């Protein structure tokens, strides 16, 4: 975010972040980071979740083009420069940067693709500078009639209105999955408690139950574990690599045996399907 110079939108820059603790209050408390809007995760919760690998895609666009950076949204930058997949979880942070990328004479360091034969696939970068073909006759390396240069330079200038001011955009994409997470949110560990009804939080996986030692042999890469109902019943302790079995806390049905209240008000209680030494 404090990088002096961002890359062009057509050749957008990508950085991989993993194996560290991430605090999102650092980005949140800065005033200039105006457009901080996230799909699939509420921003306030970023302080608690745990991610496997995260990607930061950085570029610079026009002010009105920010609305085109969205899943399922069509746009010039969406069609030919940068398309967000529909099933995308993650946030976008766009903020005005007129103070850095605008020249009174004119800035020409940033370019965007204008013509392409086909729409870009999600998270696809195309750096081809070939002369776009618009007619039946081949271009043959000549940018004549019906032969156009798909790259156009953004002529940012400070005198422009807000509609054309340069905007720096960083898209954070989360690889939220069952894989062993390494991008860890700010949270403190706790000693392991076993054989009782506890509220557990394993790498952002909330639950309530009893944690017991299990004989299941997880594959060295296999992190979680499920059952026929597709719920996490076997888990792996992130701090120390052991396999724990999760059992729902003791519950059951309670019924009341009672004669008519007309004759008496004494009652008896039947706990269904449980030996009452464990009541």
């Amino acid at each position, epitope marked *: 975010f404090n990088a002096t*110079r961002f890359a062009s939108v057509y050749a957008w820059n990508r950085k991989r972040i993993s194996n560290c603790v991430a605090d999102y209050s650092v980005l949140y408390n800065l005033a200039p980071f105006f457009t901080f809007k996230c799909y699939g995760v509420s921003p306030t919760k970023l302080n608690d979740l745990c991610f496997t690998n995260v990607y930061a895609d950085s570029f610079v666009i026009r002010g009105d083009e920010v609305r085109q950076i969205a899943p399922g949204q069509t746009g010039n930058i969406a069609d030919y420069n940068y398309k967000l997949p529909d099933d995308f979880t993650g946030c976008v942070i766009a903020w005005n940067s007129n*103070k850095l990328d605008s020249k009174v004479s004119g800035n020409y*360091n940033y370019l965007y693709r204008l013509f392409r034969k086909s729409n870009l696939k999600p998270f696809e970068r195309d750096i081809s500078t070939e002369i776009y073909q618009a007619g039946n006759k081949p271009c043959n390396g000549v940018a004549g009639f019906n032969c156009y240069f798909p790259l156009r330079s953004y002529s940012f200038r400070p005198t422009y209105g807000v509609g054309h001011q340069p905007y720096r955009v960083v898209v954070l994409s989360f690889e939220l999955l069952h894989a062993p997470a390494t991008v860890c949110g700010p949270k403190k560990s706790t000693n392991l408690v076993k054989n009782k009804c506890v509220n557990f939080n394993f790498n952002g996986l909330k639950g309530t139950g009893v944690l017991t030692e299990s004989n299941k042999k997880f594959l060295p890469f296999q992190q979680f574990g499920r059952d026929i109902a597709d719920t996490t019943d076997a888990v792996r302790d992130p701090q120390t690599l052991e396999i724990l079995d999760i059992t729902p806390c003791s519950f059951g049905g309670v019924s009341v045996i009672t004669p008519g209240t007309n004759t008496s008000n004494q009652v008896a209680v039947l706990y269904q399907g449980v030996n009452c030494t464990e009541v």
Partner: antibody
Amino acid sequence: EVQLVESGGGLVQPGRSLRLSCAASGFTFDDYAMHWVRQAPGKGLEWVSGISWNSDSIDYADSVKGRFTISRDNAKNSLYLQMNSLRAEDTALYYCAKDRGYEILTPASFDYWGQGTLVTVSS
Amino acid sequence: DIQMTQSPSSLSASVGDRVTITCRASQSISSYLNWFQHKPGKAPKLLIYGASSLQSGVPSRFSGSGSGTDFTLTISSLQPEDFATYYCQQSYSTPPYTFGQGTKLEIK
């Protein structure tokens, strides 16, 4: 905390030429632009020249065009400014300003400066 | 062309006073100015850049306000280490990086 050393000043006959050198060591010099500005002994600041992070965009003051030239060596992290065709109005102080951005003509301001070197142009 | 004016030139105050200085711009230039503290004995320093964006590393006593042509700097504390001249410089107009005339500030 960045440090800016400026050297090459002294006494010179008007009409001669000389060199001013400014070296920085407190930050990454490859991605920051620099400028040369003048503080008159009895008048306020006024911009002289400036160069970007790389030698692509260059500019000069209106009364200064065609007289002084600037250079930038990123290998040893320094920049040079040549005094040419000096007269009696160039006996002021020079400051080696560091730009916030990367280009030369931007709303970006000057962040950190250092102690300048005193020059005078007289017989 | 651009012209800038500074109504105050020399002002008097004390250690525990609050003072303000203003700058005027000939034409509207979208509030893109920076404000400089120039100590006569050492290197001058940036205090605020842009309209009201405080530069990190300086006390927050100084406050900037105003957009368009008239801009105002305010000192609420006036510490005994503020014997300097204050400058307001523009970076928007076609004439690049023109500076203003000096503003002496002292306490008596």
